[PDB]
Design a protein around this ligand. Structure first.
Ligand code: FMN
Ligand code: FMN
Ligand code: FMN
Ligand code: FMN
Ligand code: NA
Lengths: 378, 378, 378, 378
């Protein structure tokens, strides 16, 4: 079993990184194009990023829910900048309108400059104390309880969400974080622990630690991984596409991004930037794992590059560690959603092996362009 | 010079108040029905309420924006439970996706229990201090400024909204409130001051008060009024429908509703609850002004009742006081939106006079159901 | 079993017949309103009329299919004015796009003036000869057969529809007609025989006649009835609403309508026109069967008028005769669709009994408008 | 000025011709993707093919109209298989539902086998006599006339289209045909004369003939061209992409299509098949004009292949001949719609030079994926 996600580029899209050449603006029509493509191609869901660099995740997810049928939306909540009772009501409303298609990504926010801009002057350990108290109120409120809670940071009295969610006990909690406090938080409250595309050896160590701490609370959590993907029919086309993706990036842009990454107080972000060292050489840190994206883009900075057989093999290596969720992305996000679904889906377990080419449809007849007006293609 | 709004019943709908008989569940489909009706009928916009008793306003409005073309959405924000910078990004995104169809209703929250349920333990004077600092940050960030602010309650450092809104300088701010702190805040920062359906005499005093305080800041504030409406072809049918609206309300529900109203420290709620005092008699506090709605429903608790000429007469009276915005509602909200547009619109100024019956359309030809198969109606 | 249909007023809508007072123009917005209401309220489908007085059924049905989830569309085909091979491809495409939600209403056309306007100069028997040959090509082509056909009226060689339909062997064939040629055609080729709202005794004879002729061919056809419905909470309101429907109808308009009906060459139209005799008196030709609609409207000219228990009883009577399909309509079509579902559905067999009031939804919680802000309705 | 159309692959889509490898089935979701992409990218419209090899044009176009805002639809009508009065009502309905976004492609049918399959046993000259009589009735009824027409093939009495279209006097008539009868028909009745992708010298002779024949009637006929496009950043990429397109085409499939084209009774099809005569070598019949598509595809069988400067240059060569409309297509039709708009639109006249990259968008701010979370791309 495997859940394959796509990605909504709410922070912008294009053919090349760190530039405006071939860039596509974030519009409702284009986001609808990507979401409906992922919905019809059979992706389990789409991840919506959050932060100052992105449009609001909740406005986007809510606008695309009535325009899609089965696609699930992994939406980020940010404790510390919103009341947990209100956030719970937001999740309840969106889960009700979507008929149980809401997934929650718990985000603590690793940029102190962004946090101060939102009015949150908490330290790294305080952000996780807030998130811990946030989730405890959030989870109980969505289970129908009038909550009285008085913590170090948050205090509510008679917190109630009158409209229950569709998913019981609440929309599943996804969480990504690499710090010690992050692993304690995931082990206690979250349902799925997420990691960025570190090499398999590093991901194995992070999974073993989360599984160990989850055993102390008598819990078993699931695991997912966030990776870019540059797959082509051959590996030579894939590496050429990987090279062209960062060819228009000047050293003034690389050094500016790494300088902004040094300001971040995020254990996961530092581990990602440490893979490429801010240089253009040795970007293939592992077989078919390419760290060129991290030179400019924050967060996910690695990509699987190669033919379909190679990309599938690297997906199996991660799956052998206990990873069941895979959140992929490509540039541009519309075309690469079709590319990954056509090249990689037939090599993945069901239902993705059967969803390839056809998609979510039951139609037959002339499959492909008709030869003249009386010859079926073969 | 008139904008006519309708209302999305995100707190529940039905044919009768208090009871569940004839109640209509609020789903995505039914909200699409109401929103698309007001859009096609030519209403300027719809009001979406906020609170523990309602679904989330932002999730609802975002879900209905891609499903309408011209309809504006008056969406409520509540300072004190969400970061002002994050709220500005939410407003920017929705205003961009809707192409400038977003309107903001500033809500301070008049129920101390609901405020404590969300984590806010502020007094009446402190809630307006937070809103005042909230709006100052909110209005400046949406204008492209990197804001440094340090007030009594809020503190931001390098607050920025990277995606500018469509409406300049920002989506217009609507505000309702009758306390002295409310009128000072309305005079300084809001664009439209809203009032509930009080008799014209009391509305004129509140309007004259806000208008004078706003003059000290050099601002010309617009005025709107929130009112229920029960309009029928004759005045006799209207009073029958008003009686049926409350015929299934027991005295134990009235006491439970008024017991909650006394908990509210809201000045506007106190003035509305004092018009009926829980009585079932003397509900016509003014010519064609019926206060039966306020027996169980908080907020707007008065209604215009009568034939189209009587309802339009009360509307012109309010308009002669300087009121340019009108937010109406009826039970059930779908049918009454058509009834009001078909009975009252032809009696209102343009464009509502021309929008009567036809609506926002350019189609010609047979008007009405055809006679036989070749005889046009006349 | 029981399938309950609604009706799309593609020939115009309104509150009153004959006149233009309270008329609603047929627009894409309003047809979306009616279709999406019937879809969400749980109706099995909607009937779309065809003819000179209506917008094209195939364009309307195709435009609303992507905007609805489970609603079926009973679309009309008229042999003699379109190639059966092309019509077969149209049915295949719409059935494929709707994922098997297409239903076919075979219409022979009962107005010689309209038929001549379309280029058809066939007599009554010749129209049924064309229809009989049409359906044979239509059914064989949709079953994947390369058809050579040389009949009296139609001639095709190597007729093929390369895209098969979702429903096998083809979308079901509904047919309405009262002539002897109609009963032969229905007994031999159609799946469901439809009749207008005649008294149960007259319906029983037509049903027995069709059933006997189908037995001779070794076939069993189902039966449905087409009726208007004016249902109110009490019987007195229903009869008052029936009087309002024809209060704005002048005798000059009745005479012009009945003069056009005498031009028609349809047995079913004459049987319907013979129920009211072109007069306003004795319109209740049967218990709760009111023939006032036929005084101006062509086709369905009777209505079920009464309280829910009275309407549900007349439905049960028809169902005792073997009728399993019920195609209802009301004025206006949007509001009356909710009225019938909220009043009659609880008195109908499953699933209409469980779909009553709530529609097709899995939402729980506060049912009805909230009392104050923490008191659930009861 | 210039109108740039795209193409809906209602006959099938994919990456490679002649084979099922990489093929995409014609589904509602995929067609919605292609149409909404062309709508948002700024294309003037899309062409929808008709015939036995495709899904029905009217069903497809009607289903996509409510899902698009500005995109126009060039929909085919085929005289001889449908009544002109019925066809005019379909055009009136779709033009009204789309608010004037309907265009008509007049198709006579060049395949005798496909025509006989639809019940039309007319010769080449007879098909143009039917079309001439069809269009006279079609154009007159849409102008609000009760038409009496008695011709050699068609006879109508009191033909009326009750619902007038939005476009006056009627939706524009596009027409393609290279025979002498076609050029007479285009000079007299049609608004836009279309030609397939012949070399510029052969196009100039056809346009000069039509212009001369139309001047005798005092009419000016707009000119358009239909062409596939394989454009890439470099010329070598485009030529390699063109080779990949036909690399899976078996020589037995080429002969299976050329023998099918010999049966056709179309002068324009013969002129297209005479450009290569099945020869696999030297398919570049003109600078950047590649006839590789004509090996297996009927109708349009030539493509523009080259870098953006070469493709734009060939477009300007056709424009100087007087061609104002361009109907382009590519494989696959979704990805190639973006490729052409992003690569060729900036080299085209307004408004396509402004629609490049930006598209129909008034949004400002970040343009492309954000560098980190505060640095905008440049
Ligand atoms: C898969 C994944 C997705 C994430 N998405 C976001 C996001 O959208 N916005 C964000 O600010 N942080 C995101 N993060 C990062 C964390 O949620 C959080 O901001 C912080 O970096 C965790 O800090 P830590 O590694 O020091 O424990 C994501 C992390 C992962 C692994
Ligand atoms: C037109 C209008 C709409 C309002 N909408 C809301 C709402 O949706 N939620 C809410 O809590 N309060 C709403 N209020 C009430 C005030 O915004 C605020 O909550 C408080 O009651 C004002 O307190 P005050 O009158 O003492 O200054 C509304 C008021 C008006 C006039
Ligand atoms: C339920 C029902 C629906 C019908 N719908 C249509 C229609 O939409 N357009 C139409 O022209 N005739 C319609 N008819 C009438 C017949 O299909 C046909 O046109 C003709 O009147 C039958 O003639 P006959 O009774 O003499 O056999 C309908 C009949 C029934 C019973
Ligand atoms: C741009 C263009 C589009 C056409 N589209 C179609 C079509 O969709 N279906 C079709 O059968 N023929 C199509 N044709 C061909 C003609 O409409 C017609 O079928 C026939 O080939 C003309 O015959 P002629 O060249 O001998 O005058 C098209 C022609 C052109 C130039
Ligand atoms: Na390193």
């Amino acid at each position: 079993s495997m859940d394959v996600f796509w990605f909504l580029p709410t922070h912008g899209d294009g053919h090349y990184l760190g530039t405006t050449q071939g860039a596509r603006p974030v519009t409702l029509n284009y986001l609808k194009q990507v979401a409906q493509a992922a919905d019809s191609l059979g992706y389990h869901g789409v991840l919506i990023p959050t932060g100052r660099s992105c449009e609001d995740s909740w406005v986007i997810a809510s606008a695309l829910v009535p325009l899609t049928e089965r696609l699930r939306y992994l939406v980020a909540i940010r404790p510390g900048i919103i009341s947990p009772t209100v956030s719970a009501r937001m999740a309840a409303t969106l889960d009700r309108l979507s008929n149980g298609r809401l997934l929650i990504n718990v985000v603590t926010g690793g940029d102190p400059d962004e946090n101060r801009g939102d009015g949150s002057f908490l330290s790294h350990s305080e952000r996780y104390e807030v998130t811990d108290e946030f989730l405890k109120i959030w989870r109980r409120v969505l289970q129908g309880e009038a909550v009285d809670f008085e913590g170090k940071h948050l205090k509510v009295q008679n917190a109630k969400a009158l409209y229950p969610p569709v998913q019981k006990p609440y929309p599943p909690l996804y969480f990504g974080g690499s710090s010690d406090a992050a692993h304690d938080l995931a082990a206690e409250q979250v349902d799925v622990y997420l990691t960025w595309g570190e090499p398999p050896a590093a991901v194995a160590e992070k999974l073993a630690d989360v599984r160990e701490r989850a055993a102390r609370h008598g819990r078993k959590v699931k695991f997912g991984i966030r990776l870019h993907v540059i797959v082509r029919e051959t590996a030579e086309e894939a590496w050429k596409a990987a090279d062209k993706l960062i060819e228009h990036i000047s050293d003034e842009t690389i050094e500016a991004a790494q300088k902004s990454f040094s300001r971040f107080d995020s254990e996961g972000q530092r581990r990602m930037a440490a893979l490429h060292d801010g240089r253009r050489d040795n970007l293939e840190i592992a077989p078919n794992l390419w760290a060129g994206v991290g030179l400019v883009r924050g967060g996910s900075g690695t990509a699987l590059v190669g033919d379909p057989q190679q990309v599938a093999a690297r997906i199996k290596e991660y799956a052998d560690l206990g990873i069941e969720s895979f959140i992929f992305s490509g540039y541009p996000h519309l075309e690469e959603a079709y590319r990954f679904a056509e090249l990689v889906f037939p090599l993945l377990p069901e239902p993705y092996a059967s969803l390839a080419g056809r998609g979510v449809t039951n139609l037959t007849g002339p499959f492909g362009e008709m030869i003249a007006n009386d010859v079926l293609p073969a």
